[PDB]
Amino acid sequence: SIEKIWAREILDSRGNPTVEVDLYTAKGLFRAAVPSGASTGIYEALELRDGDKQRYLGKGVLKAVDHINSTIAPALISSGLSVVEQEKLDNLMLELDGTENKSKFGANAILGVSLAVCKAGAAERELPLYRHIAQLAGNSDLILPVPAFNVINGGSHAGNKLAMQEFMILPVGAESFRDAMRLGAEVYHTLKGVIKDKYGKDATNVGDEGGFAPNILENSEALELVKEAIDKAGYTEKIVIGMDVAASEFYRDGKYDLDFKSPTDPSRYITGDQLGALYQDFVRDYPVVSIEDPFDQDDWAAWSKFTANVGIQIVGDDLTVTNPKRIERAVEEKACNCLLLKVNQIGSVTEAIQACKLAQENGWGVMVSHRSGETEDTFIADLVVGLCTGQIKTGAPCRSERLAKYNQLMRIEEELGDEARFAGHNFRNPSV
Amino acid sequence: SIEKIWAREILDSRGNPTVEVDLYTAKGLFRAAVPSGASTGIYEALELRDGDKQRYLGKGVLKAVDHINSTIAPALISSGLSVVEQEKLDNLMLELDGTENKSKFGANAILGVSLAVCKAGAAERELPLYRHIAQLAGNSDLILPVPAFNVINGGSHAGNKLAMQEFMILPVGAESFRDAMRLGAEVYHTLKGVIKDKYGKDATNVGDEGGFAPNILENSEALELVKEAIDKAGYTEKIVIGMDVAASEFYRDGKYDLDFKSPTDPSRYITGDQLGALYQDFVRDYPVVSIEDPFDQDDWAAWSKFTANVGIQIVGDDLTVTNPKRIERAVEEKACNCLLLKVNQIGSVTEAIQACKLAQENGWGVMVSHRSGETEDTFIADLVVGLCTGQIKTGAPCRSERLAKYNQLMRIEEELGDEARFAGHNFRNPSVLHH
Ligand SMILES: [F-]
Ligand SMILES: [F-]
Ligand SMILES: [F-]
Ligand SMILES: [F-]
Ligand SMILES: [Mg+2]
Ligand SMILES: [Mg+2]
Ligand SMILES: [Mg+2]
Ligand SMILES: [Mg+2]
> DSSP letter string over A81-149?
--TT-HHHHHHHHHHHH-STT-TTT-HHHHHHHHHHHHHHHHHHTT--HHHHHHHHHT-----BPEEEE
What are the CA-CA distances from residue A11 to residues A14, A59, A226, A234, B397 (Å)? 8, 11, 31, 38, 8
Secondary structure of residue B242 in the 3-state scheme: strand
**Selection from B230, B234, B241, B224 nearest residue B287 by Cα:** B241
User: For residue A408, what is the nearest residue in chain B, using CA coordinates?
Assistant: B10
In whole angstroms, what is the distance from residue B428 CA to residue B338 CA?
Answer: 8
What are the CA-CA distances from residue B377 to residues A310, A376, B72, B394, B408 (Å)? 44, 9, 21, 12, 10
The pairing of strands A391-393 and A365-369 is parallel
DSSP string, A38-63: SS--TTSPP------TTSGGGT--HH
In whole angstroms, what is the distance from residue B309 CA to residue B382 CA?
Answer: 34
Minimum-distance CB partner of B189 among A57, A186, A406:
A57
Query: How far is CA B212 from its chain centroid?
Result: 18
Minimum-distance CB partner of A56 among B182, B261, B403:
B182
In whole angstroms, what is the distance from residue A160 CA to residue A214 CA?
Answer: 7
Cα end-to-end span (Å), chain B: 35
In whole angstroms, what is the distance from residue B116 CA to residue B412 CA?
Answer: 19
What are the CA-CA distances from residue B70 to residues A259, B280, B429 (Å)? 56, 52, 43
Q: Is residue A78 classed exposed, middle or buried when 0-12, 13-18 and 19+ CB atoms within 10 A define those classes? A: exposed
In whole angstroms, what is the distance from residue A25 CA to residue A362 CA?
Answer: 37
Q: Strand (E) positions, B3-56?
A: 4-11, 17-25, 28-33
Measured N-to-C along each axis, helices A107-124 and A349-361 cross at an angle, to the nearest 10 degrees, of 80
The verdict on whether residue B27 carries a ligand-binding annotation is no
Rg (CA), chain A: 21
Residues of A within 8 A of B20 (CB-CB) are 407
Exposure b/e, A144-155, CB count within 10 A at least 16 = b: bbbbbbbbbbbb
Ramachandran region of residue B257, left (φ > 0), alpha (ψ -120 to 50) or beta? beta
**Selection from B374, B384, B385, B435 nearest residue B415 by Cα:** B385
In whole angstroms, what is the distance from residue A145 CA to residue A167 CA?
Answer: 18
CA atoms within 13 A on the CB side of B184: 38
In whole angstroms, what is the distance from residue A30 CA to residue A335 CA?
Answer: 38
Does B189 sit within 8 Å of A159, measured CB to CB? no
**Selection from A284, A285, A345, A347 nearest residue A97 by Cα:** A347
Distant-in-sequence, close-in-space partners of A226: CB < 8 Å, separation ≥ 6: A151, A152, A167, A169, A187, A191, A241, A286
**Selection from B422, B383, B379 nearest residue B174 by Cα:** B422
Does B20 sit within 8 Å of A407, measured CB to CB? yes
Beta bridge partners of A338: A315, A365
The CATH number corresponding to B127-435 among 3.20.20.120, 1.10.357.10, 3.40.50.10490, 3.50.50.60 equals 3.20.20.120
**Contact of B324 with B350, CB cutoff 8 Å:** no
- Indicate the domain borders of chain A: 1-126, 127-432
In whole angstroms, what is the distance from residue B263 CA to residue B283 CA?
Answer: 29
Identity of the amino acid at A109? A
Q: What is the whole-number distance in angstroms between the Cα of residue B295 and the centre of ligand 3?
A: 12
Active-site entry in B20, B209, B374, B401: B209
The verdict on whether residue A126 carries a ligand-binding annotation is no
The CATH number corresponding to A127-432 among 3.50.50.60, 3.20.20.120, 2.40.128.20, 3.40.50.1010 equals 3.20.20.120
Secondary structure of residue A392 in the 3-state scheme: strand
In this structure, is the dihedral angle defined by the CA atoms of residues A326, A328, A333 and A338, taken in order, positive or negative? positive
DSSP string, A298-342: T-HHHHHHHHTT--SEEEESTTTTT-HHHHHHHHHHT--SEEEE-
**Selection from B117, B119, B127, B125 nearest residue B90 by Cα:** B117
CA angle, residues A380, A395, A408, in degrees to nearest 5: 40
Dihedral over alpha carbons B142, B127, B19, B91 (to 10 degrees): 80
Does B376 sit within 8 Å of A404, measured CB to CB? yes
**Selection from B13, B33, B132 nearest residue B385 by Cα:** B132
Does A215 sit within 8 Å of B185, measured CB to CB? no
**Contact of B69 with B130, CB cutoff 8 Å:** no
Q: How far is A264 from chain B (nearest CA, A)?
A: 16
What are the CA-CA distances from residue A179 to residues A369, A432, B56, B58, B137 (Å)? 20, 21, 11, 15, 41
**Selection from B41, B37, B20 nearest residue B29 by Cα:** B20
In whole angstroms, what is the distance from residue B166 CA to residue B50 CA?
Answer: 29
CATH number belonging to domain A1-126: 3.30.390.10
Where do runs of H (alpha helix) occur along B43-164?
62-66, 73-79, 86-97, 107-125, 129-137
Chain length of chain A: 432
Residues of B within 8 A of A185 (CB-CB) are 11, 15-16, 56
Minimum-distance CB partner of B185 among A15, A206, A407:
A15
Does A204 sit within 8 Å of B206, measured CB to CB? no
Secondary structure of residue B241 in the 3-state scheme: strand
Secondary structure of residue A365 in the 3-state scheme: strand
Active-site entry in B102, B192, B238, B342: B342
> Which backbone phi and psi does A340 adopt, to 5 degrees?
-85, 125
In whole angstroms, what is the distance from residue A345 CA to residue A111 CA?
Answer: 10
Does B13 sit within 8 Å of A400, measured CB to CB? yes
Instruction: Provide the resolution (angstroms).
Output: 1.4
What are the CA-CA distances from residue B22 to residues A414, B68, B73, B120 (Å)? 12, 10, 11, 10
**Contact of A144 with A385, CB cutoff 8 Å:** yes
Residues of A within 8 A of B400 (CB-CB) are 12-13, 374-376, 399-401, 404
In whole angstroms, what is the distance from residue B41 CA to residue B345 CA?
Answer: 8
